[PDB]
């Protein structure tokens, strides 16, 4: 009960995420967008933050994956669950309990290579360009906690970012996308070519993609 032909309004995807929302887990919503830009040229590489008016949810429980001291830095940041390969294994074991995952570059080769089949479809997979991956584990642990998200230029000019969860009532979820969008829009360079937002798409684990009208 999804139409490939159809282009969806921000509201229409929003209600459609809930239709398809399963109760076995609360799914993070993500907006994906093709930015008309050329990442090759450095001037349109887009970097910017926005505060989702309702955030990622209010009691955001964070899983930090890291090595070294940055593990302590991560539980002194106030992370609800910290760890290392033990933590990965406790996921493969089948433990999904967290609302968010963040990580240092250091472990990403392992987290990327192992957790990808599991975290990714649920929008729990750390990405540096979602501002969930970095050596400053402290800021990310708080910013994500503070509900602030930062987009970064993908290599092909994609962008992703968590917009919140499928349990959100849909109007509250709509406000998030337009918000992220509005702050996404703000960052177009001056010498950019045709329309800044080429394609934008809503996703969850049950809606592999919708294409939306970002101005609706
Ligand atoms: Cl179901």
Swiss-Prot record:
Keywords: Repressor, Ribonucleoprotein, Ribosomal protein, RNA-binding, rRNA-binding, Translation regulation, tRNA-binding. One of its GO terms (cellular component) is large ribosomal subunit. Disulfide bonds: none annotated. The keyword tRNA-binding applies. It comes from the Bacteria. It holds the Pfam family Ribosomal_L1. The keyword ATP-binding does not apply. GO terms for molecular function: rRNA binding; structural constituent of ribosome; tRNA binding. Belongs to the universal ribosomal protein uL1 family. The L1 stalk is quite mobile in the ribosome, and is involved in E site tRNA release. Binds directly to 23S rRNA. Protein L1 is also a translational repressor protein, it controls the translation of the L11 operon by binding to its mRNA. Part of the 50S ribosomal subunit. This is Large ribosomal subunit protein uL1. It comes from Thermus thermophilus.
